[PDB]
Design a protein around this ligand. Structure first.
Ligand SMILES: CC(C)(COP(=O)(O)OP(=O)(O)OC[C@H]1O[C@@H](n2cnc3c(N)ncnc32)[C@H](O)[C@@H]1OP(=O)(O)O)[C@@H](O)C(=O)NCCC(=O)NCCS
Ligand SMILES: CC(C)(COP(=O)(O)OP(=O)(O)OC[C@H]1O[C@@H](n2cnc3c(N)ncnc32)[C@H](O)[C@@H]1OP(=O)(O)O)[C@@H](O)C(=O)NCCC(=O)NCCS
Ligand SMILES: CC(C)(COP(=O)(O)OP(=O)(O)OC[C@H]1O[C@@H](n2cnc3c(N)ncnc32)[C@H](O)[C@@H]1OP(=O)(O)O)[C@@H](O)C(=O)NCCC(=O)NCCS
Ligand SMILES: CC(C)(COP(=O)(O)OP(=O)(O)OC[C@H]1O[C@@H](n2cnc3c(N)ncnc32)[C@H](O)[C@@H]1OP(=O)(O)O)[C@@H](O)C(=O)NCCC(=O)NCCS
Ligand SMILES: CC(C)(COP(=O)(O)OP(=O)(O)OC[C@H]1O[C@@H](n2cnc3c(N)ncnc32)[C@H](O)[C@@H]1OP(=O)(O)O)[C@@H](O)C(=O)NCCC(=O)NCCS
Ligand SMILES: CC(C)(COP(=O)(O)OP(=O)(O)OC[C@H]1O[C@@H](n2cnc3c(N)ncnc32)[C@H](O)[C@@H]1OP(=O)(O)O)[C@@H](O)C(=O)NCCC(=O)NCCS
Lengths: 157, 157, 157, 157, 157, 157
């Protein structure tokens, strides 16, 4: 009964996120994707849309499920009966801040954090940058699941 | 008559800050903790509370005093008759930005900046992260002075 | 017919920027400085003032011209009939984010990004830090073109 | 079913290494410690003493075994029926390198690498630094397991 | 009129090196690949094979030539009638060093250095890692040009 | 009463080292330059010439003395009646390492390490790079004190 949580805001989910989902799914018996929305920061997609996009991109992963989190990621992790977090690393990641959170999460709840480097082809995509480029007419279709592409296309007119 | 200034917003002061205060105090004849509040950014604690918390955490350091700064840190430093700043380094610190400020401060006023690594046990605490975790019910009591813990507890109800 | 674009918000232009302009100008047949203003973020100087300051600082560079960009930097680059961007590196630069943008820009439009380290004397100046120090009465005159200094002086009273 | 390999030269094993072994053992069904032989550049302890030191230091982890490797780490991993490497991060880790190896290992054999931050109290110990300090008379006994301390003090008397 | 030098030991040349050659050849009138001889620390291939490998791998770039250098890279650059060095950035690059050399080269001869990020698919290959993996039986043929692969498989049979 | 140790191999001392000596001498009552002997890996200048070079380059600092050390830097520091090390940061510094040593030195003897950024004009010089360039005929005389320049030009004629 091994398990890991993949936390994030996923606004929207990218192929960078999916690559990490797939690696977590391959190495742990169970994997929970936790969508932790910021109560102060409203992004582009609403919670239901973010859930849909994640679920639409992870139908091929039987041991993975999507779930909404509130408050501490470690509280969510423990409520799943798990003690592990898996985080992706890419080009631009604030790794020092990821390390700070990792140590903090370990300190407050005994939760381990495992970092894994995203595949090179998906190493420069992030949610905020994909949105920025897309909303200015740039083609990021290869850097996002097709369901996400369909929805970004809907917001052109 | 050697002296160093430890500048910051201290909202709230952490055991990371105190560790740096103690090391500065051990190496310099006089040490001034400068609380430089951001006029645009309002945090959690008001200036009086921030002063109180710093003073409540530094009663054991005879050659240290707490003082409020306005404008340039270098203007505050020079007004204390000093030419040195001591800054802490921890897990997550934007060190490139600390370096930029250090060079700038040296350029504009001839003020030296000394960096020192915080003790490992207090290396992942920061004011903003401690607040975030605490306000979601997380236990950061070991990562803050007891007086600070008492005040964070008061803001639960 | 070689060419490079030097993009930025230049609010205001610094001697760090100029140093990069000069190096780009020395190595490419044509060089276009693209002023890409953020539609969400309003800074200190208006677009006309930013253009003036850049033009006032680059009269000595015959193969360089100043032009306003809208939307994607790569769209601006391609519209100049170019395939290259030149970016400066200094003390504090978020290099991981510069790398992310570089890879992204290459992916979406085949545009190459060339990075060059600014001269050490101008390695700690940035637009935001120069403004912060100046508006608190600090002397950054050596870290900015004289025309920029004149304008920063006008906003004291 | 799940498994991870913890590779290294372990000359000698530190409490930093053991911390990582413990994290891996808690999150995977099986952990294999792979002791890989370095080039002409040989070390203080021979292979048998290295094996024994790791073994005596990990008696509290029943799902962990120790094994020598002679070629590619990925070949070792695959021959064990696994597809994951777990590696520790400490102060002084060459991350740039670790990431290069991770990407290379993923490319040549499809093996994933997971990185974990070592506990702060054990974040500054490394085999080479421990050896250097110990040989010069310094006390690193709190940073190494007792089986290592025993063999270390026998070498210096 | 415009020109760039791409310096290195190229032992052997990788598809990471070639990617950079291609970027330079597209943006400058002339590119010179400078093969500089390392100290006593010699390598796998001799100078003539190194030259031939670079030559056979760059037949698709008519504005590129290959030349041996024996002293300072800046002396090579200047003797070629140029003032620019182009260097690739990959996962595992010692940037801290590259920047030091860039500043030193600028100081001693006024030579500019331009950095370019290698294509993601070729971002984890380096000469030394490719050699290590190949000698241990791993397949790095997708990361090296065929002229290098040919000479590499002849050395291991 | 206050004191700092500036440790190194100083082979040879650079104007980067001297900048740091000057910062330390201005902020502490006493500064001791500790010349520590490296392992089998010996250098260009012998110990006596190294001592003399540091001495002749620091005549303008009356509160600074020079002394050889043979073991742990912390043992040197403590035997001098001090508890502080001052170390310079330059372009190309291995910070990751410096921090590891700082934490280790604090752990084994309670000695604090203070880091200071070298002046920009002297931020790219290091002993090894200066030696490399000088031996190849390059002019590094502006980056080294004249006592070093004298002994350097006598070695190359
Ligand atoms: C959910 C959580 C893991 C963040 O997930 P996320 O939003 O998907 O994280 P991302 O991958 O998008 O990147 C982090 C974002 O924070 C920002 N960030 C980066 N460095 C930062 C730093 N030093 N300080 C604050 N924010 C930072 C970045 O802008 C980044 O967004 P962007 O790069 O896309 O513009 C985190 O907020 C969390 O755990 N929330 C629950 C509350 C909690 O437990 N907090 C305590 C953590 S110890
Ligand atoms: C007081 C001063 C030293 C900052 O102190 P501080 O607020 O305690 O600094 P902190 O330790 O909290 O960390 C810096 C904060 O700035 C932010 N920061 C980090 N990198 C940054 C960067 N690249 N650019 C802008 N802000 C940055 C961070 O969010 C961090 O807060 P957080 O990590 O807790 O979320 C500085 O603002 C100052 O000197 N103010 C006086 C005005 C002045 O002299 N300015 C000129 C400086 S050259
Ligand atoms: C114009 C452009 C190159 C930015 O230029 P710029 O504003 O002059 O950049 P700067 O040199 O001032 O520095 C970048 C700023 O972004 C911020 N920044 C730094 N790291 C960041 C990160 N990780 N994520 C988001 N913003 C970041 C910094 O605050 C910095 O400002 P500051 O350091 O002065 O406070 C970029 O916004 C752009 O290309 N815009 C056009 C739209 C586009 O093409 N976007 C797609 C890029 S792939
Ligand atoms: C065994 C292996 C994981 C290394 O483990 P290790 O020796 O315990 O690793 P450590 O972190 O203790 O030490 C790494 C050492 O290499 C050095 N290292 C760091 N950066 C390096 C670089 N750029 N190039 C080469 N070595 C580097 C460090 O100096 C460090 O030694 P130190 O303790 O003296 O600092 C690895 O060498 C390996 O996989 N070997 C098997 C062969 C193989 O698979 N090769 C191809 C891998 S893609
Ligand atoms: C030729 C030259 C550009 C180097 O090229 P190169 O060998 O292809 O460079 P690479 O990136 O492949 O390798 C750099 C190597 O040096 C090492 N390097 C990295 N950091 C270093 C450091 N701090 N100090 C010394 N070498 C370092 C790396 O370990 C790397 O080797 P690797 O592949 O085993 O990792 C350079 O040495 C040069 O200019 N030589 C001519 C002489 C000269 O001009 N000297 C003064 C320069 S300011
Ligand atoms: C003397 C001492 C401070 C080093 O000083 P130094 O030689 O002048 O330091 P420098 O910055 O000039 O050089 C550091 C060198 O080590 C190397 N260094 C950097 N990273 C390293 C690493 N990961 N592992 C080992 N050495 C490293 C660098 O390559 C650099 O050499 P360079 O100029 O060729 O780049 C240190 O070795 C010391 O304290 N010695 C005394 C013994 C002791 O106390 N040991 C335990 C310390 S915790």
């Amino acid at each position: 009964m091994t398990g890991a949580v993949c936390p994030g805001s996923f606004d929207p989910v990218t192929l960078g996120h999916v690559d990490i989902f797939e690696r977590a799914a391959a190495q742990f018996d169970e994997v929970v994707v936790a969508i932790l929305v910021n109560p102060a920061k409203t992004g582009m997609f609403d919670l239901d849309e973010r859930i849909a996009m994640v679920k639409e991109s992870t139908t091929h992963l039987p041991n993975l499920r999507v779930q909404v989190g509130h408050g501490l990621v470690v509280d969510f992790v423990r409520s799943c009966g798990m003690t592990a977090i898996v985080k992706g690393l890419r080009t631009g990641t604030d790794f020092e801040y990821e390390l700070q959170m990792a140590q903090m999460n370990k300190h407050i709840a005994g939760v381990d954090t495992f970092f894994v480097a995203t595949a090179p082809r998906y190493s420069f995509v992030s949610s905020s940058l994909a949105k920025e480029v897309a909303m200015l007419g740039g083609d990021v279709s290869e850097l996002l699941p097709e369901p996400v592409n369909r929805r970004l296309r809907d917001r052109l007119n």
